[PDB]
Design a protein around this ligand. Structure first.
Ligand SMILES: Nc1ncnc2c1ncn2[C@@H]1O[C@H](COP(=O)(O)OP(=O)(O)O)[C@@H](O)[C@H]1O
Ligand SMILES: Nc1ncnc2c1ncn2[C@@H]1O[C@H](COP(=O)(O)OP(=O)(O)O)[C@@H](O)[C@H]1O
Ligand SMILES: [Mg+2]
Ligand SMILES: [Mg+2]
Lengths: 52, 371, 371
C-alpha cells in the first residue's frame, strides 16, 4: 500500500517540475524602465514648429 | 532558440517567451479607426490604432474587437493585431521563433486552418502548434486529472480530463462569457439613469464591472437585503466626474452566469453545465472529477464565485462525494502559464508542425496527426 | 531450488512459491487497453495495464479477460499476464524455477500444448507440469477419496476420486460459473432501474454479488417473504454515491446454480450433477463418496450454500446414507494450497517434464506418460 500510494506522488513530481522549474525561463520583466525627470531643465524649445 | 507562446484570447492578447512566469505584454485586442474628420495638418495621425494605444485615444475612435466568440470574424484586423504583437510589444522577428497559439474547443475548422496559413505565409514562422485552451489551464495547476471550467471573455467551455485522456464526448461549450455580462450590465445600468451607448463607453462599463461587481452567495437574500438597507451602494467616479452609485446591480450582473435566462439564453448556468459534463463521464472517474474541479479564465475572478459554485454543485451532487474547487490566485494568466510549461517540455519538442510538412500537405495539416 | 506454483484460473491469478500456506500475489487477470485519446504529453501512459493496476484505472480502460471458459482465447494477452506474474508480482526470473500450472478437466488439447510450448520457449523454464484443478483441491483437504465440486469463475467441474484412483468416466463438467452469475445479476438489476453496461461496471456488479448475495435455504419461502416484508433489502454505496437497494435480487442471482434454466441453460443444477456423477461410479464406493463430498473454488463461498446443497442431495440420495459436505474456510485458495503440497512432495520430484524431454518429443509430450 505504501509503494502504491508513493507511486502517485512520484508521478505528480513531474507535474510539479513542469509547473515550477519552467517559470525560471525569464523573470526580469519586473524591472521597470528609466522614466527620468527634467527638474525644470528639459525646457529648450519655443512655439516655432508644432506639426513636426 | 526560444518559443513564442502567444494566446489570442478574446478581449486581452497575452504573449511572452516560453519558460517565464507571466506574459510579457498584455493588452486589449481592439482596432479602432478614427471617425471624425481631423483638421490639424501634420499631426501624424495614423489610420488605425491597435492594442493599448487605442485605449488612450478611445474618445475619438470606434473600437471593434476582431474576435467575436472564439471564432475570428475579421481576418485583416486579426492580422494587424498579430503584427503589432510580434513587432512592437515583443520586438522579435517571427522568422526565428516557433509559435504556440491557443484555440477554444469545438471551433470551426476554417478558423484554425486560416490561422495556420497566415502564420506560415505572412509572418513566415519556423513552426507553429495549436492547443486547446483548457488542457493548458490544467497544465498550470500541476494536476493530471480534473474538469476545468475556462470562462474566458468570449466563450465558456468545460473540458473534463482524466489521467491525461481527454473525453471528447463530454465537452460542454457555452457562449455566455464576460462580453455578454458587460452588455447586460450596460443594459441594467439604465434603470438608474446612466446611459452608455458608444462603443467607447463599453470600456467604462467593463471597468465598472471589474471593480465593483461580485457574485452573491445566495441570490434571494441579497436581493432582499439590497432592497431594505443601503450598505451595498458603492460609488464610482467616471472618467470626467459625476460619480455614480451602483445598488443591487452589483451582484445582478454576474448572476447571469448561474441563470442564463436573464439575457434570454435557454441553457443552464455554469453551475449545472459542469455537473452535466461530469455525469456524461464514466461512472468510475466521477469522484476524481468531483474532487479536482478547476477554475480558470478571466471571468472567474469575481469575488465570491468559488463559494457559490461549490454550494451549487454540492446541492446537485450526491451527498457522499467531496466537492473541491481549485481557484488559484493566478487565474487570469493560467492558460498562458500552462502554455509556457507545455512549450518548455522536451517531450513536446517534436510535435511542432514543421514548415516542410505544411508545404507538403497544405493548411489542412492541422487536423492531421499533428493536432 | 523452489518450485513456482502458478494457477492461471479465470478471474483471479494465484501464484506463490511451493511450501507456503497462501499464494503470494493474487490479482485479477484482466488486460485493458486505454480507449480515449489522451491529451497530456509526457504523462508516461502505457499501452496496456494488466493485473491489479487495471482495476484502479478502470474508468478509462476496456478490460477484457483473456480466459473465457477454462480455455484461453487470446494467447498474446495470456503471455502478457504470465510475464507480469513472473517479473513484477514475484520478481523471480523463470530461468531458475520449475512451474506447476493447473488446467480444468476436459479442456481442448491445443490449449494445453500451447501452454507448455510458451512456458518452454518464451519464459524458458527448467521444467513444467500441468495438473487437473480438482485433484489439488482434494490434496488440500488432506483426504484421499471424495468427490470434489470445484465451482470456479470460469467453469464448474465435478471430479470423483476413490482411494487415489480417479474415475475418468464420471467427470461432469458444466460451464455455468461465477461469470454467468455476474451477467445474470447485471441483467436482473435492470428491474429496479440500475443499468450497468460498460465492461468496467461489470466489476461493480461483481462486487455487489460478492458482498450482498447469498443462497437461500428454500427458494419459494424466500420469494414469498421478500415479497411481503422488507427485512431483506440491503443497501450498497456505488463508487460515486447514489446508494442502491437490492431486494429479492439477493438470493435470485446465486439460485441460478441450482436452476440453470434461469439463464436458459438446459442442464441440471450443481445439486443434481453431483448426484449423477456419483451414480455413474461403481456400486461399492458410493457410500464413501456420499460421506466425503468436497466443495472448493471461489463461487462456493456464498453464505448458506453448504446447507442448501446438503438438503438437496439428502432429498435425492437414499435415506440410509449419510451426506456430509466438507466446506473448509480456506475454500478460495484450496486449489493453490493443494498445488503447493503436491509440489513439495519428494515422490513427485521425478514427474516434471524436463526440458530435454520436450526437445526430443515436441509439445505433444504433455499427453504422454508425463501427464
Ligand atoms: N478582476 C476581474 N474581475 C472581474 N472580471 C474580470 C476581471 N478581470 C477580467 N475580467 C473579465 O474577464 C475578461 C478577460 O478575460 P480573459 O481571460 O482575458 O479572456 P481570454 O480568454 O480571451 O484571454 C474581461 O473582459 C473582463 O470582463
Ligand atoms: N466471497 C465471495 N462471495 C461470493 N462469490 C465470490 C467470493 N469470492 C469470489 N467469488 C466469485 O468467485 C470468483 C473467483 O473464483 P476463483 O476461485 O478465483 O476462480 P478461479 O478458479 O479462476 O481461480 C469471482 O469472480 C467471484 O465472482
Ligand atoms: Mg482564455
Ligand atoms: Mg479454480
Amino acid at each position: 500500500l505504501g509503494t502504491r500510494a508513493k507511486e502517485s506522488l512520484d508521478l505528480r513530481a513531474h507535474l510539479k517540475q513542469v509547473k515550477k522549474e519552467d517559470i525560471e525561463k525569464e523573470n526580469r520583466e519586473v524591472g521597470d524602465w528609466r522614466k527620468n525627470i527634467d527638474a525644470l531643465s528639459g525646457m529648450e524649445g519655443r512655439k516655432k514648429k508644432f506639426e513636426g | 532558440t526560444t518559443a513564442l507562446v502567444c494566446d489570442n484570447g478574446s478581449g486581452l492578447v497575452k504573449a511572452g517567451f516560453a519558460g517565464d512566469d507571466a506574459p510579457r505584454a498584455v493588452f486589449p485586442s481592439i482596432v479602432g479607426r478614427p471617425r471624425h474628420q481631423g483638421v490639424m495638418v501634420g499631426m501624424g495621425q495614423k489610420d488605425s490604432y491597435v492594442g493599448d494605444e487605442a485605449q488612450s485615444k478611445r474618445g475619438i475612435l470606434t473600437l471593434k474587437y476582431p474576435i467575436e466568440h472564439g471564432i475570428i470574424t475579421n481576418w485583416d484586423d486579426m492580422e494587424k493585431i498579430w503584427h503589432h504583437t510580434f513587432y512592437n510589444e515583443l520586438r522579435v522577428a517571427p522568422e526565428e521563433h516557433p509559435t504556440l497559439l491557443t484555440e477554444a474547443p469545438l471551433n470551426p475548422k476554417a478558423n484554425r486552418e486560416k490561422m495556420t496559413q497566415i502564420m506560415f505565409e505572412t509572418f513566415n514562422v519556423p513552426a507553429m502548434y495549436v492547443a486547446i485552451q483548457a488542457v493548458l489551464s490544467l497544465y498550470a495547476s500541476g494536476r493530471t486529472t480534473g474538469i476545468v471550467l475556462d470562462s474566458g471573455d468570449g466563450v465558456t467551455h468545460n473540458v473534463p480530463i482524466y489521467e491525461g485522456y481527454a473525453l471528447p464526448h463530454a465537452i460542454m461549450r457555452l457562449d455566455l462569457a464576460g462580453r455578454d455580462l458587460t452588455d447586460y450590465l450596460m443594459k441594467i445600468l439604465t434603470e438608474r439613469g446612466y446611459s452608455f451607448v458608444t462603443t467607447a463607453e463599453r470600456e467604462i462599463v467593463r471597468d465598472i464591472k471589474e471593480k465593483l461587481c461580485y457574485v452573491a452567495l445566495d441570490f434571494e437574500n441579497e436581493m432582499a437585503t439590497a432592497a431594505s438597507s443601503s450598505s451595498l451602494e458603492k460609488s464610482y467616479e467616471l472618467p470626467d466626474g459625476q460619480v455614480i452609485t451602483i445598488g443591487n446591480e452589483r451582484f445582478r450582473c454576474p448572476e447571469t452566469l448561474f441563470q442564463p435566462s436573464f439575457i434570454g439564453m435557454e441553457s443552464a448556468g455554469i453551475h449545472e453545465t459542469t455537473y452535466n459534463s461530469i455525469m456524461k463521464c464514466d461512472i468510475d472517474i466521477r469522484k476524481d472529477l468531483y474532487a479536482n474541479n478547476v477554475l480558470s479564465g478571466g471571468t472567474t475572478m469575481y469575488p465570491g464565485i468559488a463559494d457559490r459554485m461549490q454550494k451549487e454543485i454540492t446541492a446537485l451532487a450526491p451527498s457522499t462525494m467531496k466537492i473541491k474547487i481549485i481557484a488559484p490566485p493566478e487565474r487570469k494568466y493560467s492558460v498562458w502559464i500552462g502554455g509556457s510549461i507545455l512549450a518548455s517540455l522536451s517531450t513536446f519538442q517534436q510535435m511542432w508542425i514543421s514548415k516542410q510538412e505544411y508545404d507538403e500537405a497544405g493548411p489542412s495539416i492541422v487536423h492531421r496527426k499533428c493536432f
